Design a protein around this motif. Structure first.
Motif, PDB file in Angstrom:
ATOM      1  N   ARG A   9      31.274  37.040  43.083  1.00 30.74           N
ATOM      2  CA  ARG A   9      32.144  36.699  44.200  1.00 30.74           C
ATOM      3  C   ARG A   9      33.532  37.282  43.988  1.00 30.74           C
ATOM      4  O   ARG A   9      34.030  37.338  42.861  1.00 30.74           O
ATOM      5  CB  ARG A   9      32.221  35.177  44.379  1.00 30.74           C
ATOM      6  CG  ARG A   9      32.734  34.732  45.736  1.00 30.74           C
ATOM      7  CD  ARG A   9      32.668  33.219  45.875  1.00 30.74           C
ATOM      8  NE  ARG A   9      31.293  32.741  45.787  1.00 30.74           N
ATOM      9  CZ  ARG A   9      30.934  31.465  45.784  1.00 30.74           C
ATOM     10  NH1 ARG A   9      31.830  30.493  45.855  1.00 30.74           N
ATOM     11  NH2 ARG A   9      29.644  31.155  45.711  1.00 30.74           N
ATOM     12  N   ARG A  13      44.339  35.861  46.073  1.00 28.56           N
ATOM     13  CA  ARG A  13      45.240  34.718  46.129  1.00 28.56           C
ATOM     14  C   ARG A  13      46.650  35.140  45.750  1.00 28.56           C
ATOM     15  O   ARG A  13      46.885  36.243  45.251  1.00 28.56           O
ATOM     16  CB  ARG A  13      44.802  33.596  45.185  1.00 28.56           C
ATOM     17  CG  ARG A  13      43.422  33.034  45.422  1.00 28.56           C
ATOM     18  CD  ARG A  13      43.301  31.687  44.734  1.00 28.56           C
ATOM     19  NE  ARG A  13      43.378  31.824  43.283  1.00 28.56           N
ATOM     20  CZ  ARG A  13      44.224  31.169  42.497  1.00 28.56           C
ATOM     21  NH1 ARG A  13      45.106  30.311  42.984  1.00 28.56           N
ATOM     22  NH2 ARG A  13      44.188  31.385  41.186  1.00 28.56           N
ATOM     23  N   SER A  28      34.235  37.065  39.896  1.00 25.13           N
ATOM     24  CA  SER A  28      33.494  35.959  39.304  1.00 25.13           C
ATOM     25  C   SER A  28      32.013  36.293  39.238  1.00 25.13           C
ATOM     26  O   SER A  28      31.493  37.022  40.088  1.00 25.13           O
ATOM     27  CB  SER A  28      33.691  34.671  40.108  1.00 25.13           C
ATOM     28  OG  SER A  28      35.063  34.430  40.359  1.00 25.13           O
TER      29      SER A  28
END
Ligand SMILES: *[C@@H]1O[C@H](CO)[C@@H](O[C@@H]2O[C@H](CO)[C@@H](O[C@@H]3O[C@H](CO[C@H]4O[C@H](CO)[C@@H](O)[C@H](O[C@H]5O[C@H](CO)[C@@H](O)[C@H](O)[C@@H]5O)[C@@H]4O)[C@@H](O)[C@H](O[C@H]4O[C@H](CO)[C@@H](O)[C@H](O)[C@@H]4O)[C@@H]3O)[C@H](O)[C@H]2NC(C)=O)[C@H](O)[C@H]1NC(C)=O
Lengths: 162, 120, 56
Positions: A9, A13, A28
């Protein structure tokens, strides 16, 4: 070898520090372990050593040396199996799944020697001196396999299904 | 070397293509599906990895098709769910070396199957 | 004698556990060692019932 990647994934951010807000990107992986190695190397030997305990109940009750040797050998081997594994992985301060499994097997093989202590005390010291000695073995030859199988089933039905 | 043979062709809907591999497949961990038709270049469809199970799909078939495998049979399957007329093409099964380049490029695949024509 | 051999067979496994990567699938050597184990294991079940049948 140990893992198969279920998914990966991508995320983006902003992270805030005392010196300002900074952009972040995150990659991830969901890694799920392959249980076959542990089945071949750890779980199956534990089961086999546990089964080795149940041979005790077929040996005649007056061959005390053999009963004791086999039971104590089983307990010692189980303790060694317990202690060997934790050197391969961090000394983290809680019980793992395999730790619970091995402690349950230890409980079974330990009660499979407390059982001999019971029968020997009833036989040599306290129907009790003739029949009850055989009755306990007759119970155990089925009760211990049954209870261990029930424990194994419940263990897997907890950890794999929930 | 590795030999590939495919099945499930012919006129169509829903369909399944299959690919059977034999030989030294360990040197070729990834199996890919390609398709071509007259007047157009060969297209990447999707890929599967032996013993890993991971897949990736071209956006033209994403969420329509799926690819699966049987490691014991050494077969690779492509589920042609919800075919459309533009899917008409000869579908090729191919093997990719461990250190070949990207998935999406046919030149990276060494051993190629005979290919099955489909009509829709 | 029987249990001692059983311990020895496992003792071989605990070493072969170390020399190789922790792979999932069963290897040719593993297929042999577990082949030996069942022979060594059954050799103890042999007496387990010889003792039972004799003293029964
Ligand atoms: C491994 O573990 C890590 C850590 O647990 C996982 O990382 C997390 O992944 C998820 C996705 O699966 C991330 O969520 C996404 O994050 C972004 C960014 O959101 C931030 O920035 C926004 C813009 O400024 C901001 O508005 C957000 O704050 C609001 O929204 C959050 C929602 O959670 C809410 O709680 C707040 O109160 C605010 O309202 C936030 O600061 C964003 O783009 C994504 O939004 C999508 O999903 C939401 C779902 O509600 C939807 O509303 C949107 O429309 C959009 O579709 C999404 O929230 C998360 O940030 C990651 N966390 C960390 C700490 O990194 C990782 O996924 C795990 N990996 C695996 C493989 O398991």
């Amino acid at each position: 070898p140990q893992f198969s990647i279920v998914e990966h994934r991508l995320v983006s951010r902003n992270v805030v520090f005392a010196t300002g807000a900074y952009p972040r990107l995150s990659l991830s992986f969901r890694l799920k372990r392959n249980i076959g190695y542990f089945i071949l190397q750890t779980y199956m030997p534990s089961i086999l050593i546990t089964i080795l305990s149940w041979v005790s109940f077929w040996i005649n009750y007056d061959a005390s040396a053999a009963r004791v040797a086999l039971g104590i050998t089983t307990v010692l081997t189980m303790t060694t199996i317990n202690t060997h594994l934790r050197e391969t992985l961090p000394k983290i301060p809680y019980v793992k799944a395999i730790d619970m499994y091995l402690m349950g097997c230890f409980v079974f093989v330990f009660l499979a020697l407390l059982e001999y202590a019971f029968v020997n005390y009833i036989f040599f010291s306290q129907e009790l001196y003739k029949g009850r000695a055989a009755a306990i073995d007759r119970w155990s030859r089925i009760v211990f396999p049954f209870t261990f199988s029930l424990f194994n089933l419940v263990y897997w039905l907890y950890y794999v299904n929930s | 070397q590795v030999q590939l043979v495919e099945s499930g062709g012919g006129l169509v809907g829903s369909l399944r293509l299959s690919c059977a591999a034999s030989g030294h497949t360990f040197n070729y961990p990834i199996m890919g599906w390609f398709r071509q038709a007259p007047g157009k270049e060969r297209e990447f469809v999707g890929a599967i990895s032996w013993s890993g199970g991971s897949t990736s799909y071209a956006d033209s078939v994403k969420d329509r098709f799926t690819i699966s495998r049987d490691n014991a049979k050494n077969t690779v399957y492509l589920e042609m769910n919800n075919l459309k007329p533009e899917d008409t093409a000869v579908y090729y099964c191919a093997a990719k070396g461990r250190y070949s380049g990207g998935l999406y490029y046919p030149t990276n695949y060494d051993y190629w199957g005979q290919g099955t024509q489909v009509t829709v």
